[PDB]
Design a protein around this ligand. Sequence first.
Ligand SMILES: Cc1c[nH]c2ncnc(NCC(C)(C)O)c12
Ligand SMILES: [Cl-]
Length: 167
Amino acid sequence: VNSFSGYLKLTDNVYIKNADIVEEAKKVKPTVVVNAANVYLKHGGGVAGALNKATNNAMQVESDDYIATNGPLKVGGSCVLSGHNLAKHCLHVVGPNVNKGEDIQLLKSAYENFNQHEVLLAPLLSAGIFGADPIHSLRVCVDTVRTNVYLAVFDKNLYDKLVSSFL
Ligand SMILES: Cc1c[nH]c2ncnc(NCC(C)(C)O)c12
Ligand SMILES: [Cl-]
């Protein structure tokens, strides 16, 4: 039993909710919140820009030190950093950004990072400003993640289509 509330159940392990991941994070304080990161950990917009704003830019400061030490992530890769005031940890996961021409096949690799954590709060990878079809992202999530994932979908209109079309 966990404190995630109001979710619709999709499969043995995936739950979905029309919700602002920022507001969900502050309420639940999950062990892991997933960020929709880029390889440079430049949290400018989309989910990343909003999460970073909620940390008063502490996420960006920590991220800049991470990159200065380690260099960029791989598309499909991840790193674990602090969750600041939002969660214990933030798993920064880089899905492909279609508006950069990145290969969509890497979306499965991106979701595989979730399997290293028993429970996560997350957005749909490569959705929003990364330019992938969220219906496809949800399908890859369900077919790749085996740990318990609670998906927050910000757009209510998008949320209803994912459910009604869900196979
Ligand atoms: C931008 C944002 C802020 N808080 C969020 N919580 C969940 N999903 C999000 N992004 C979804 C999409 C499809 C617009 O990228 C967000
Ligand atoms: Cl977005």
